[PDB]
């Protein structure tokens, strides 16, 4: 069937920038004729060659495309004028979710559950099509109106068939002993989250980017005593050294088990999206 005319810079309301990163620049639109909201990022074409960054471009177009859940950033279009590239993005308002962990300090028993299962079940759908996020961290988990999860960042993202380095404090073992990158990399970034939910900070913290890789390596990390323990269990199957052997990876038999583990206990995998998050502190 045909699409809807093609979109030009001309049929926005530009407002805020939302973000700002090292090739784009997101921005708030206002759609004239609709009067929606959408996060438009800014890319220059120039800059992406002179920076070789046109797979990365390419990916992160591609992947968005294949996306359709309720967790995920959503494209609704792409357009171009001679300088630039438009990507429009669905709106969080609320920002990161880092923000929120700032805000109240650290989450309580109810709301790290909730916000868990939620990344779970996003994490859950991603590697049922095959892409590794790479980069996965608070500062990629957005707050829609509603207050429930939209994860982007897809540019870092690897769409697998049968070379990168995320952020230094979610970087899993694997990546800085044989530079490798699987599903499980996301897993190993799951955990670090839980503990930076529950403890309100991430578990490997030091001086420079060389300290932290040390701690990664050497697992050198420490639950404090108030942290819940069934959170601390299912943190213990996560950031475990062997990437094989982390809870919700193929070779420990998928997402079945760890959306099994007692910290999920309460929790309605069938509907989340529609349930009503729980109120922060
Ligand atoms: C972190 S700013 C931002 N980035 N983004 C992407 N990359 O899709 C968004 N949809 C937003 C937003 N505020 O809605």
Same mark, same amino acid.
């Given at each position: 069937?045909?699409?809807?005319?093609?979109?030009?810079?001309?049929?926005?309301?530009?407002?805020?920038?939302?973000?700002?990163? =090292?090739?784009?620049? *997101?921005?708030?639109?206002?759609?004239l /004729?609709?009067?929606?909201? $959408?996060?438009?990022?800014?890319?220059?074409?120039?800059h992406?060659?002179?920076?070789?960054?046109?797979p $990365? *471009?390419?990916?992160?177009?591609?992947?968005?495309?294949?996306?359709?859940?309720?967790?995920? *950033?959503?494209?609704?279009?792409?357009?171009?004028?001679?300088?630039?590239?438009?990507?429009?993005?669905?709106?969080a308002?609320?920002?990161?979710?880092?923000? $929120?962990?700032?805000?109240?300090?650290?989450?309580?028993?109810?709301?790290?559950?909730? $916000?868990? /299962?939620?990344?779970?079940?996003?994490?859950?759908?991603?590697?049922?099509?095959?892409?590794?996020?790479?980069?996965?961290?608070?500062?990629?988990?957005?707050?829609?109106?509603?207050?429930?999860?939209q994860?982007?960042?897809?540019?870092? /993202?690897?769409?697998?068939?049968? =070379?990168?380095?995320?952020?230094?404090?979610?970087?899993?073992?694997?990546?800085?002993?044989?530079?490798?990158?699987?599903?499980?990399?996301?897993?190993?970034?799951?955990?670090?989250?839980?503990?930076?939910?529950? /403890?309100?900070?991430?578990?490997?913290?030091?001086?420079?980017?060389?300290?932290?890789?040390?701690?990664?390596?050497?697992?050198?990390?420490?639950?404090?005593?108030?942290?819940?323990?069934?959170?601390?269990?299912?943190?213990?199957?996560?950031?475990?050294?062997?990437?094989?052997?982390?809870?919700?990876?193929?070779?420990?038999?998928?997402?079945?088990?760890?959306?099994?583990?007692?910290?999920?206990?309460?929790?309605?995998?069938?509907?989340?999206?529609?349930?009503?998050?729980?109120?922060?502190?």
């Open positions: 069937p045909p699409q809807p005319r093609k979109k030009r810079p001309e049929d926005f309301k530009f407002g805020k920038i939302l973000g700002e990163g =090292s090739f784009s620049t *997101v921005v708030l639109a206002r759609e /004729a609709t009067s929606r909201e $959408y996060a438009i990022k800014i890319l220059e074409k120039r992406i060659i002179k920076e070789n960054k046109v $990365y *471009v390419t990916r992160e177009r591609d992947v968005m495309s294949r996306l359709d859940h309720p967790f995920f *950033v959503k494209l609704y279009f792409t357009f171009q004028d001679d300088e630039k590239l438009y990507f429009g993005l669905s709106y308002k609320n920002g990161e979710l880092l923000k $929120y962990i700032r805000k109240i300090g650290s989450f309580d028993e109810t709301c790290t559950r909730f $916000y868990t /299962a939620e990344i779970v079940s996003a994490l859950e759908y991603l590697h049922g099509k095959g892409i590794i996020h790479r980069d996965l961290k608070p500062e990629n988990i957005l707050l829609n109106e509603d207050m429930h999860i994860i982007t960042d897809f540019g870092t /993202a690897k769409v697998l068939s049968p =070379s990168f380095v995320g952020t230094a404090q979610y970087v899993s073992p694997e990546l800085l002993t044989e530079k490798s990158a699987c599903k499980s990399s996301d897993l190993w970034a799951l955990g670090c989250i839980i503990y930076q939910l529950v /403890a309100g900070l991430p578990p490997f913290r030091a001086g420079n980017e060389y300290l932290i890789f040390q701690k990664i390596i050497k697992l050198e990390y420490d639950f404090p005593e108030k942290f819940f323990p069934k959170a601390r269990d299912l943190v213990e199957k996560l950031l475990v050294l062997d990437a094989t052997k982390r809870l919700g990876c193929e070779e420990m038999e998928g997402y079945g088990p760890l959306k099994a583990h007692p910290f999920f206990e309460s929790v309605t995998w069938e509907n989340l999206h529609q349930q009503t998050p729980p109120k922060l502190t």
